[PDB]
Amino acid sequence: AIGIGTLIIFIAMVLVAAVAAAVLINTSGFLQQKAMATGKESTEQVASGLQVIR
């Protein structure tokens, strides 16, 4: 019967789509930290300094 294969290949299709989704979720995590830090650090740099009074 044709049905048998249709079932089995569906199982595969789901699994592949899961793996594909995963990499984006993971990568978004990696980028989150890197981005946030870069902004903070850059801000502190511009904002700060010393001045010679006399």
Partner 1 sequence: AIGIGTLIIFIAMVLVAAVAAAVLINTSGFLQQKAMATGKESTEQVASGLLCS
Task: Give the residues lining the site for partner 1 (CB under 8 A).
Answer: 1, 3-4, 7-8, 10-11, 14-15, 17-18, 21-22, 25
DSSP codes, 7-54: HHHHHHHHHHHHHHHHHHHHHHHHHHHHHHHHHHHHHHHHH-------
Q: Which is nearer to partner 1, 25 or 50 (CB)?
A: 25
Closest contact distance (angstroms) between CB of 21 and partner 1 is: 5
Closest contact distance (angstroms) between CB of 30 and partner 1 is: 14
Q: Which is nearer to partner 1, 1 or 52 (CB)?
A: 1
- List the one residue out of 52, 51, 30, 34 whose CA is nearest residue 42: 34
